[PDB]
């Protein structure tokens, strides 16, 4: 669905995320977890964390922050030819972590909140359009693999 024009857009904005990955990673997860509290319970690793504060204090959260965004960057760099790297993830997210497609919706809303918050004024209408689009693409493909595996429908 995306044009090069757009992918350029997508990879420029990713350059902001890369300057401080554990930084963007931490806030993504915190925003996910606070706005959507039910999501925290899918992690036996973070479930203990009631407060936000307590969350921001967590190096383990930060370290996950970095894994999550290191994996997406990888997909994103691939400009849609990502069957190779998304196959593994759709699998583990479906059958083992048992993460509903709607929680991937949420973190996608989260990546966008976080970029405005942290980049107030240099993440324009075009880049937001492009960022939205590659995150939907990521999502539509997991969705295809969830259907297959017959997980939630
Ligand atoms: C932006 C999309 C996401 C990416 C790229 C991603 C990436 C990853 C990676 C690479 C791992 C470890 C490798 C594996 O176990 O497959 C993982 C583990 C996990 N994911 Fe995700 N994730 C994403 C979204 C989510 C969401 C939205 C949830 C649920 C609310 C979730 C739940 C989990 C859990 C519970 C683990 C296991 C961590 C542990 O126990 O060490 N993931 N994630």
Curated annotation (Swiss-Prot):
Residues 1-147 form the Globin domain. Gene3D superfamilies: 6.10.140.2100, 6.10.140.2110. Keywords: Cytoplasm, Heme, Iron, Metal-binding, Muscle protein, Oxidoreductase, Oxygen transport, Phosphoprotein, Transport. PANTHER family: MYOGLOBIN. This is Myoglobin. Monomeric. It holds the Pfam family Globin. It is an enzyme of class 1 (oxidoreductase). Heme b binds at residue 93. The gene is MB. It comes from Equus caballus (Horse). It is found in: Cytoplasm, Sarcoplasm. Belongs to the globin family.
């Amino acid at each position: 669905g995306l044009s090069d024009g757009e992918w350029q857009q997508v990879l420029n904005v990713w350059g902001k995320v890369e300057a401080d990955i554990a930084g963007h990673g931490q806030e993504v997860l915190i925003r996910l977890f606070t706005g959507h509290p039910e999501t925290l319970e899918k992690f036996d690793k973070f479930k203990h964390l009631k407060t936000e504060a307590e969350m921001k204090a967590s190096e383990d959260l930060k370290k996950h922050g970095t894994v999550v965004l290191t994996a997406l960057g990888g997909i994103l760099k691939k400009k849609g030819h990502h069957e190779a790297e998304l196959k593994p993830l759709a699998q583990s997210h479906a059958t083992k972590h048992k993460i509903p497609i709607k929680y991937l919706e949420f973190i996608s809303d989260a990546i966008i909140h976080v970029l405005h918050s942290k980049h107030p004024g240099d993440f324009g209408a075009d880049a937001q359009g492009a960022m939205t689009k590659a995150l939907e693409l990521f999502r539509n493909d997991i969705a295809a693999k969830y259907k297959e595996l017959g997980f939630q429908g």
